[PDB]
Amino acid sequence: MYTFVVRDENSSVYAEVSRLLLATGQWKRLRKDNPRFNLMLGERNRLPFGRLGHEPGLVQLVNYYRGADKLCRKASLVKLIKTSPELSESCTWFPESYVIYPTNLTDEREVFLAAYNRRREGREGNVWIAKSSEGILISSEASELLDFIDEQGQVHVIQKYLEKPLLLEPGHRKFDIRSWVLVDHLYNIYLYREGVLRTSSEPYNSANFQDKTCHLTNHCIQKEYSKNYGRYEEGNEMFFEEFNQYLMDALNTTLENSILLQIKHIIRSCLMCIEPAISTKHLHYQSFQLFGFDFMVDEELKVWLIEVNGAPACAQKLYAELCQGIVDVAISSVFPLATSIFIKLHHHHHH
Amino acid sequence: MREIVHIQAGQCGNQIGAKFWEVISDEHGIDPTGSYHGDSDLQLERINVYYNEATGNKYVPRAILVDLEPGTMDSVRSGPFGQIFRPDNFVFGQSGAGNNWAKGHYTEGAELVDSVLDVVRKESESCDCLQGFQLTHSLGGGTGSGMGTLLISKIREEYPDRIMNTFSVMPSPKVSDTVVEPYNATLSVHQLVENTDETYCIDNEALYDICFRTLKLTTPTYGDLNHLVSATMSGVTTCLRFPGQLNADLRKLAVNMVPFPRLHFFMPGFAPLTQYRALTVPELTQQMFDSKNMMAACDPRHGRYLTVAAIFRGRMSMKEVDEQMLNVQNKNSSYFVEWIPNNVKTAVCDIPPRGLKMSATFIGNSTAIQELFKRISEQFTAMFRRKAFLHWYTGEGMDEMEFTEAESNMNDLVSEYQQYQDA
Amino acid sequence: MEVIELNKCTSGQSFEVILKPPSDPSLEEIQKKLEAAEERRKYQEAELLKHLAE
Amino acid sequence: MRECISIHVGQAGVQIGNACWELYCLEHGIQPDGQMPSDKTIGGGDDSFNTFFSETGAGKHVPRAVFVDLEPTVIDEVRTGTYRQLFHPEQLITGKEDAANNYARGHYTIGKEIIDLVLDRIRKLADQCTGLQGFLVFHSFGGGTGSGFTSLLMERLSVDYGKKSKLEFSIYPAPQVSTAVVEPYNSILTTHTTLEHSDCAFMVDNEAIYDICRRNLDIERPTYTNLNRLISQIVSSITASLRFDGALNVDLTEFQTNLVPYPRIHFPLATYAPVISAEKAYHEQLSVAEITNACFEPANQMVKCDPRHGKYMACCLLYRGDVVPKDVNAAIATIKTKRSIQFVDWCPTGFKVGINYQPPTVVPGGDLAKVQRAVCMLSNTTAIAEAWARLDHKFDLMYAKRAFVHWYVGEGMEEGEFSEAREDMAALEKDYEEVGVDSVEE
Numbered sequence A: 001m002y003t004f005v006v007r008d009e010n011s012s013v014y015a016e017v018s019r020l021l022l023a024t025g026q027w028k029r030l031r032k033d034n035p036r037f038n039l040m041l042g043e044r045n046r047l048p049f050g051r052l053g054h055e056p057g058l059v060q061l062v063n064y065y066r067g068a069d070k071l072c073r074k075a076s077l078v079k080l081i082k083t084s085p086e087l088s089e090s091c092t093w094f095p096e097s098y099v100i101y102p103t104n105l106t107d108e109r110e111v112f113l114a115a116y117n118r119r120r121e122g123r124e125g126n127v128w129i130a131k132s133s134e135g136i137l138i139s140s141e142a143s144e145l146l147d148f149i150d151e152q153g154q155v156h157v158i159q160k161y162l163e164k165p166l167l168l169e170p171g172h173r174k175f176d177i178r179s180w181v182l183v184d185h186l187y188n189i190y191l192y193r194e195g196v197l198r199t200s201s202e203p204y205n206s207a208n209f210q211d212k213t214c215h216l217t218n219h220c221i222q223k224e225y226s227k228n229y230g231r232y233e234e235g236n237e238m239f240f241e242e243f244n245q246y247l248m249d250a251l252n253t254t255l256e257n258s259i260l261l262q263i264k265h266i267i268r269s270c271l272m273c274i275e276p277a278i279s280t281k282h283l284h285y286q287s288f289q290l291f292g293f294d295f296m297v298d299e300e301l302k303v304w305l306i307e308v309n310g311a312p313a314c315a316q317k318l319y320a321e322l323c324q325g326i327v328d329v330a331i332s333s334v335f336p337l338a339t340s341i342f343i344k345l346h347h348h349h350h351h
Numbered sequence B: 001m002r003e004i005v006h007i008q009a010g011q012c013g014n015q016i017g018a019k020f021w022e023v024i025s026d027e028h029g030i031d032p033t034g035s036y037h038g039d040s041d042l043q044l045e046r047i048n049v050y051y052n053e054a055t056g057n058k059y060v061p062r063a064i065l066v067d068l069e070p071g072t073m074d075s076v077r078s079g080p081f082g083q084i085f086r087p088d089n090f091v092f093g094q095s096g097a098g099n100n101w102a103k104g105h106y107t108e109g110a111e112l113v114d115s116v117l118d119v120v121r122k123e124s125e126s127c128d129c130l131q132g133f134q135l136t137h138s139l140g141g142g143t144g145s146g147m148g149t150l151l152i153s154k155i156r157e158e159y160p161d162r163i164m165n166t167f168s169v170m171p172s173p174k175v176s177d178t179v180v181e182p183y184n185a186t187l188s189v190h191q192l193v194e195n196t197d198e199t200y201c202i203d204n205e206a207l208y209d210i211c212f213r214t215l216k217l218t219t220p221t222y223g224d225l226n227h228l229v230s231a232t233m234s235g236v237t238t239c240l241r242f243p244g245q246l247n248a249d250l251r252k253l254a255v256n257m258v259p260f261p262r263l264h265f266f267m268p269g270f271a272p273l274t275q276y277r278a279l280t281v282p283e284l285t286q287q288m289f290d291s292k293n294m295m296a297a298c299d300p301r302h303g304r305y306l307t308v309a310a311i312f313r314g315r316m317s318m319k320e321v322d323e324q325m326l327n328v329q330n331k332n333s334s335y336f337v338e339w340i341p342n343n344v345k346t347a348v349c350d351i352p353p354r355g356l357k358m359s360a361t362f363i364g365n366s367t368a369i370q371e372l373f374k375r376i377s378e379q380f381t382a383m384f385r386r387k388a389f390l391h392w393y394t395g396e397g398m399d400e401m402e403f404t405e406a407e408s409n410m411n412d413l414v415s416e417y418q419q420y421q422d423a
Numbered sequence C: 001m002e003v004i005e006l007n008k009c010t011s012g013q014s015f016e017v018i019l020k021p022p023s024d025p026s027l028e029e030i031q032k033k034l035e036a037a038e039e040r041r042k043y044q045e046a047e048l049l050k051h052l053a054e
Numbered sequence D: 001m002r003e004c005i006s007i008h009v010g011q012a013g014v015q016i017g018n019a020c021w022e023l024y025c026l027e028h029g030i031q032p033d034g035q036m037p038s039d040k041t042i043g044g045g046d047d048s049f050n051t052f053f054s055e056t057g058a059g060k061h062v063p064r065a066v067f068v069d070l071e072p073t074v075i076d077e078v079r080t081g082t083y084r085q086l087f088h089p090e091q092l093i094t095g096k097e098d099a100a101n102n103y104a105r106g107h108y109t110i111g112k113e114i115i116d117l118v119l120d121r122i123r124k125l126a127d128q129c130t131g132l133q134g135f136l137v138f139h140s141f142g143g144g145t146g147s148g149f150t151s152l153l154m155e156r157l158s159v160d161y162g163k164k165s166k167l168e169f170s171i172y173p174a175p176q177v178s179t180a181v182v183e184p185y186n187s188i189l190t191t192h193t194t195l196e197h198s199d200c201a202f203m204v205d206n207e208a209i210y211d212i213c214r215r216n217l218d219i220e221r222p223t224y225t226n227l228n229r230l231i232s233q234i235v236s237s238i239t240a241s242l243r244f245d246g247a248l249n250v251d252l253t254e255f256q257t258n259l260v261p262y263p264r265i266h267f268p269l270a271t272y273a274p275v276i277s278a279e280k281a282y283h284e285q286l287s288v289a290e291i292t293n294a295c296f297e298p299a300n301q302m303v304k305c306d307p308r309h310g311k312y313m314a315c316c317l318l319y320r321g322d323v324v325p326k327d328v329n330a331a332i333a334t335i336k337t338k339r340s341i342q343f344v345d346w347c348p349t350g351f352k353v354g355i356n357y358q359p360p361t362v363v364p365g366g367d368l369a370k371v372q373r374a375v376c377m378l379s380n381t382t383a384i385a386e387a388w389a390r391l392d393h394k395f396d397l398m399y400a401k402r403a404f405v406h407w408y409v410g411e412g413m414e415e416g417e418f419s420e421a422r423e424d425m426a427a428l429e430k431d432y433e434e435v436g437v438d439s440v441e442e
């Protein structure tokens, strides 16, 4: 009889995982502050990693990687890419990005305009987005960006806006791709074979960057502020079977060749970069964690990483499968009970 | 922390105390004449905790024997180890106490108690460093109960910085001498709550049930109850009588077992319950925590453990003992209070008790002990609400108010346990 | 990666390697505290003995 | 030459002292009867080893050491054991009843009656010193004497030797070998009272030593003897620069200067490699690269914690055996490109390196294999505050219910000292966080 504790009550994924664990009849849930657990499904903020792994007679496992926030915060991700040799500034799949602190509060504001001006000079599309880790501005004029940033009080990021996105027809409309990645205690990287396209139901419009429902494919901003939520697909959600058949019919490619190769390359590069900082291979406790990677596809079928989410929810159709997979490869791998839905990402090129 | 002074009071106190001295004199290789004849010198390293050394290398129990009638102490003096005791430490009256707490505490016992304290003082004065006192008695009679609690009060007055420890046999209607036992027991518990540091609750209910259900004795005698008691007493004092790290003196035990001054009533347990089958470390561990091995008729699942001391005896794997203790805690963690971290402490002693190659003794501070006190309370109220049998007590000068007060204090103790069971 | 302050002797050697540059109460008070604690002990004992005298 | 006096308090302090002085004697060729054939200046001298040993006309080398315990059984084993003749009776001080795992009993009740005798025996030792540097104090956090008496002694040493340095070696409590439920209380209490009086303190978590003994020495159930022989190796590795010729950490002041830029953050993490079982039939000797790399595995630390998720303020490598600087610098270069080693901004990223060519000495018949080179890393990393976090959590759990507090109040301690000590620990955890961390349904 294995034991576990639940310290995040607002998590779809791990609510479903707890229910499956109980249904096995080999897992017992304890009170959130009982220390004699095998498994901690922990809180998202200030999780006490320092108290794990000091319980004699208990192999202990937690569903977060201490240190993985460097990937999963806007400013820390841009810092990690620009400063890590294996990602480098010569990184072809991350959009040009700069970290900027409000005037109220290193910062990169000077270096940002250095390139902004050879895009003013150079005739190039000079549209940029500003975001923080609600509160988005898209503009071709830098000073609207900087002033909007200093109007707020937290650190923001300025990132090149991708002006030529791939657009689904019918609709002439934007989307982003969400991939779910499980990293187990052995640092196997498992991509869930089902992704989801969060589409916009509004046609794209390169002239008014201020009506942000053809520009922000977030399921929330589409579920209310947009007119056509659910026209083409249920809940602005296209899945991989459909998107693949579309690529085959319209572009004469597959999802595998034109997009997924890049996505796997990006996931493996990010996680292998931070692996020495977060691995629990020789630690007194062990970690796994579920990530959501968010990608954009431009019109030449080039994939761009937009961000990484350290605590993602699932698509409602997929919970059942994904959560069962989490118990299969992340939990029962460590604590055995009495056609994999994942692709293992591994590659050993010799040179 | 070296010497312990032992006191046994009344019929039950003296019968079980004599069995206790027999058992541990056997363990320490001391023979009925006080001569050492053992093979290990772990037998002698801490022999002075319980024995004085006379010359001839004779070992004399630091034991004072107390009664208000001479009957049981004559039988002790004629029993197996009767002559080992120091003759001047037999302190007895002639009149008896009539199963009456008031006679033991206020009238007959008051006449004898100074005699007892003279012997107690002569024994304490020859102590290099007295740790304190242990008393064996019942709560259901008059001498062990009334005079026993009188003695405890007087000893605390004269040695307020020493540990006071009792083995207290609780009355049960299933094994009962008179109808007034709930009165005597309630009055005594009131004293114990205030004036002892650690009390082993031995329930004649539980001893009976073990003898009947488990040892397949159809007609248990006091003799059979006292076998269980003397085995348990030997177990719970192992750590005081042999070299070791954990709970090796009375104060350190108190510090580990008593998180709140009044909640010092312990549920003891023993395994294996007594054959030639070998018992494995997992089997010892499961049995010692089994409700059916507890000497206090309380369901441990009805409460939570505040603290636990476990003592394994014999040659076995330390690694396996640690693993099994960890396993019981980890798989029944709900029953140990989460606000006392690491509240289960484990000792191992290489010398097993007579007739066994392996044994385990359990000492639990469980909130489930409240079931014992509730039981006494109900039996008390059933009579007290009609003031039945009171005249035996008012005839010795007691007033009903003293009963009302002792009942209220016992119900307060029950409430305090319930508080920590829900904290 | 710079090695400095190298010192050698028959017993061994020491040095430093830089990879990157920088980017009480009196006797009085004590005895007062010990004696305040002893007095709290003596008061608690006197309260106990008063109760036992009653 | 400047002398150091060692003070061993309580069971843990005394048994660890036994093991350390045994080792020292083996390392300097001093026989159990105190004679040292290789010491050619009979009856005196100011060699490096005289920092720890004084000399008699008969040629006896006598530890500069005081043993204190509030009960006699443990120091009696010193009085009658293998090194009976090393120590002079006046250096071994016992009471008769101990502190019952109760800080308040060791500090207020029994401490008050023994402190003056102890300070007088310490004063005798200091009177035979031409230039005392200060003190090395060994004790447990969890015991009543180790916590309570040690904190009293520390305050009084600050009073009577106000300019001397004071170093601690402290055993942090582990349930697998602990003797008492109230050890979190005692720990916090003694840390609170000792903090401003200690210049540098080396914490040893019994849980880390216990797992090292099981995993690398293949001891199924380690005893205090196993633990203490390993601890004595680490301690000797740390003090070797006071006892041998060299230029790193040659006096107590240098430990603070090299390891403690902020005086409250004075708890360096020790990491030791290699630990090799003596019954291991076939062993391939580890290189400079491998043992230096092992300095960065949490499994080899004296406190289990994760230095990747904190920052370094200082780092010292202490090597014993066949080691030359070029191999050290190559190993460090390799390691810095494969591991997470972040220093605080206001400190240089670098290592101070000491090499003594004599490889570790091991006790004949002990558990530890002889090896050709070994290393002890002393790093001041904020990650050691994980241990404080653990202690403070257990303290909070019990004190919220006032469980066991009456034992301390009954010794004359005021309940408010509990919350004072706990708030000092909260400040301390806050300091570690300020130094070591940066500002941090989808």
Ligand SMILES: Nc1nc2c(ncn2[C@@H]2O[C@H](COP(=O)(O)OP(=O)(O)OP(=O)(O)O)[C@@H](O)[C@H]2O)c(=O)[nH]1
Binding pocket: D009, D010, D011, D012, D013, D015, D016, D069, D070, D098, D099, D100, D101, D102, D106, D139, D140, D141, D142, D143, D144, D145, D146, D147, D171, D172, D173, D174, D177, D178, D179, D183, D206, D224, D227, D228, D231
């Ligand atoms: N590593 C190690 N730890 C020890 C040793 N002896 C005791 N301990 C630990 O120290 C704590 C107990 O404190 P002790 O040093 O025994 O207590 P004490 O200082 O003698 O104080 P009192 O007995 O209460 O008077 C527990 O955490 C023990 O596991 C030892 O020899 N080696």
Ligand SMILES: Nc1ncnc2c1ncn2[C@@H]1O[C@H](COP(=O)(O)OP(=O)(O)CP(=O)(O)O)[C@@H](O)[C@H]1O
Binding pocket: A095, A129, A131, A159, A160, A161, A162, A163, A174, A175, A176, A215, A216, A217, A218, A294, A296, A306, A307, A309, D441, D442
């Ligand atoms: N550089 C960029 N270029 C073009 N479009 C971008 C972009 N960055 C973000 N977007 C658009 O904004 C949306 C992403 O916003 P953001 O990266 O801040 O996610 P979020 O934190 O608001 C919710 P979630 O964490 O679930 O993704 C995408 O749908 C995308 O269409």
Ligand SMILES: Nc1nc2c(ncn2[C@@H]2O[C@H](COP(=O)(O)OP(=O)(O)O)[C@@H](O)[C@H]2O)c(=O)[nH]1
Binding pocket: B009, B010, B011, B012, B013, B015, B016, B097, B098, B099, B100, B138, B139, B140, B141, B142, B143, B144, B145, B169, B170, B171, B172, B175, B176, B177, B181, B204, B207, B222, B223, B225, B226, B229
């Ligand atoms: N377990 C046990 N209980 C006893 C024994 N003798 C008497 N009792 C119980 O003790 C109580 C009677 O007290 P007793 O010791 O005879 O009275 P006292 O002589 O006045 O102290 C009742 O609860 C009896 O069941 C005995 O030898 N063993």
Ligand SMILES: [Ca+2]
Binding pocket: B111
């Ligand atoms: Ca009379």
Ligand SMILES: [Ca+2]
Binding pocket: D039, D040, D041, D042, D043, D044, D045, D046, D055
């Ligand atoms: Ca000399």
Ligand SMILES: [Ca+2]
Binding pocket: C024, D158, D196, D197
């Ligand atoms: Ca100071």
Ligand SMILES: [Cl-]
Binding pocket: D160, D161, D162, D163, D164
């Ligand atoms: Cl001075």
Ligand SMILES: [Mg+2]
Binding pocket: A307, A309, D442
């Ligand atoms: Mg986000």
Ligand SMILES: [Mg+2]
Binding pocket: B011, B141, B177
């Ligand atoms: Mg009778």
Ligand SMILES: [Mg+2]
Binding pocket: B114
């Ligand atoms: Mg008289």
Ligand SMILES: [Mg+2]
Binding pocket: D010, D011, D071, D098, D143, D145
């Ligand atoms: Mg001790």
